[PDB]
Ligand binder design. Sequence first.
Ligand SMILES: [Zn+2]
Length: 48
Amino acid sequence: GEFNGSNAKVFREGKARRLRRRQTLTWPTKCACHEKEPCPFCLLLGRY
RNA sequence: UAUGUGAUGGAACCUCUCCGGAUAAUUCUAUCUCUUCUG
Ligand SMILES: [Zn+2]
């Protein structure tokens, strides 16, 4: 996935913003995942 | 009743300090009671 960037505001009427503070895990990359046919993890996340 | 590519809040002991204490022989004698009718 990506797990970066984003524009979370933790509210619709305030800036504040919501961000991570811990470490994100990794796994080796296999197959092709893109906009047309996202992998199940990206489909759940909806990063595209 | 959220709004979405990002939430270690299991991420914090109502904790700390303070003699239910102090004083006292289970002992012992003076009355009580008010209206009587000329005396
Ligand atoms: Zn993917």
